[PDB]
Structure formats: C-alpha cells, structure tokens
Ligand binder design. Structure first.
Ligand SMILES: *[C@@H]1O[C@H](CO)[C@@H](O[C@@H]2O[C@H](CO)[C@@H](O)[C@H](O)[C@H]2NC(C)=O)[C@H](O)[C@H]1NC(C)=O
Ligand SMILES: *[C@@H]1O[C@H](CO)[C@@H](O[C@@H]2O[C@H](CO)[C@@H](O)[C@H](O)[C@H]2NC(C)=O)[C@H](O)[C@H]1NC(C)=O
Lengths: 153, 141
C-alpha cells in the first residue's frame, strides 16, 4: 500500500483485531513510532485486557472502536491516509453501548483516569470527528458487533 | 558533568538497557541516591496510571533519569530516541501522560528536588538517523 513520510498502509498482521478489520483492507501504521505494527499490537492487547472489566454490552463495541481507531483503514490515494472513526460511531459507543463506563464517568475523572471506567483508553474525542452524513466515505462506520439488553435510537 | 557506571539501584533494574553503563550527575553530592530518589518519587504517580501507560511511562522515566552512556572510555550520556519518546507520551500514555507529568514535576518542585524534565520528543534525534546515537527503550525493544 501507499508509503510516505509519516507512515504507511499495509494489511493487518495481528490476531486481536482480526474479526473486526476487513480481511484484505489496508490500515495505517504510524512511523513516528518504532516498529509501529508491533507497538500498535502491544497496545491493543493491553487495551483489550482492560476491557474485561467493562459490562457485556459495552465490551464488543469498545473492542471494535479501539480496533478501528488504532488501526485506521486507509482511503484510496497515492498518500497513506488514515480514515478516522465517524462521529456517530464514536457517540454510539460513548453514549449507548458504554454509557455507564464512558458518558457517565465524565466529570468524575478527577478520581483518576484509570479509576474512571474507560477514560484512560486511547479512544477519540467524538466532537473532533467527522460525520457519517457529511461524507459517508471519509470515515469508518460502526461495524457488525458479535454478541454471543440493547440500547435503542 | 558526571560519570558512567553500572546501575546499583533497586527501581530500574529490568527497565534499563542490558549490560550498559548509565550516567550519574555529579552536580549532586550523592548522584546514585539522588537519581534513585527521583525515580522513587516518580513511582508515586506511576502507581496511579493504567497498565496501558504504566510500563511505557516507567521505561521512559528510568532511561531518562539514568541516561545510557555511549561506548568508550570517555563516554557521553545518550538522548532517548525520538520515536520511543513519542510512542510513550502519545501512544501508550495518550490520555494520561501530561497529567502524570504535571503531577510528578510539581511534586519534585514542592520538595525542592533538582531534576531535569523529560525532553520534548521533537527535540530528540531519530532512531533511523544513527541507531547508535540514541537510546531504544527495552519495553518496546
Ligand atoms: C502519528 O503519531 C504522531 C506522534 O504521536 C501524531 O502526532 C501527534 O498528534 C497528536 C494528536 O493526537 C497531537 O496532540 C500531537 O501534537 C502530535 N505530535 C507530534 C509530535 O506531532 C500523529 O497524529 C499520528 N498520526 C496519525 C494519523 O494518527
Ligand atoms: C546535572 O544536573 C543539574 C542539576 O539538576 C543540571 O543543571 C540544570 O540544567 C538545566 C538545563 O535546562 C537548567 O535549567 C538548571 O538551571 C540547572 N540546574 C542547576 C541548579 O544547575 C544539569 O543539566 C545536569 N547535567 C546533565 C548532563 O544531565
């Protein structure tokens, strides 16, 4: 895939995010970091282990969000260009699936980010993300979540 | 302004580069105790950060406070490689780093303890520039 000054696009080679990421898709690896494929994989491992603490509703949504956010699909082009999470995807997880662990813990983060549910996790700030309805191709949408009760919109 | 020797402390054993010598700043009357005390004080805040950040943050703090010395009989303290600094501050500790750094810096200032702050990562050299010119944190290898 495309390579450039700040990173490159390549197929995912790990096992944690295997079921979430599109099989043949290219994802962005950030060469600001050393051996980014290894570093990103070590991070997602540790992130997923922390998600054993969250509710059964929240878990698959947060897992998918962390995967789509830490391994961002590359949009077509000659440059390596990561697609951010759609705002609606972010807000869904924040306000619906993980409401108790994320939205509710806002303003209670003074007790410690690690002691505040989910706020220590490398999740994006949903306000700073583009919309599904501004350009549905410019961001990653909420994928199929495997649950094996539900928030309503 | 100091000497290079084997790390003789308790905190940073697994965290420093294997079989390397590290830098002791002789601006302190007891550099090995003073630098040991700095990482001890840092651990008060390390306690409080998540296991996503904690091992990365410790690696950075230990290797910063106990700089790896270059090879040779007149060795020099190496900087941390830019990439490793960025991975720690902005990947592994993306949410928690600045708050932990604020708290650690201020606890040191309150105590009247002399210290160097972790550098701005962008001011550091790349690992690709010259692999022998900067420290690669063992946590990330
Ligand atoms: C690749 O990594 C770099 C370094 O961490 C990122 O640049 C930082 O972006 C954050 C936003 O999360 C800013 O707050 C920092 O000021 C930036 N740091 C530097 C040194 O520029 C960059 O965003 C990453 N690229 C992608 C596409 O995620
Ligand atoms: C050895 O330690 C001393 C004291 O902590 C360092 O001196 C400080 O250096 C910074 C440079 O940014 C200055 O802002 C301070 O004024 C200095 N403090 C004092 C009281 O002298 C010195 O840089 C260290 N040397 C090395 C090579 O690490």
């Amino acid at each position: 895939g495309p390579r450039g000054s700040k990173g490159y696009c390549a197929q995912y080679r790990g096992e944690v995010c295997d079921a979430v990421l599109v099989k043949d898709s290219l994802v962005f690896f950030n060469t600001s970091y050393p051996d980014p494929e290894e570093a990103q994989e070590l991070l997602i491992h540790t992130a997923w282990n922390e998600l054993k603490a969250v509710s059964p509703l929240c878990r698959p949504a947060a897992e998918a969000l962390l995967c789509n956010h830490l391994f961002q699909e590359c949009s077509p082009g000659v440059l390596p260009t990561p697609m951010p999470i759609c705002r609606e995807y972010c807000l869904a997880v924040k306000e619906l699936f993980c409401a108790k662990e994320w939205l509710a813990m806002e303003g209670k983060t003074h007790r410690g980010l690690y002691r505040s549910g989910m706020h220590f996790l490398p999740v994006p700030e949903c306000s700073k993300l583009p919309s599904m309805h501004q350009d549905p191709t410019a961001c990653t949408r909420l994928p199929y979540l495997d649950y094996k009760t539900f928030p309503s919109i």
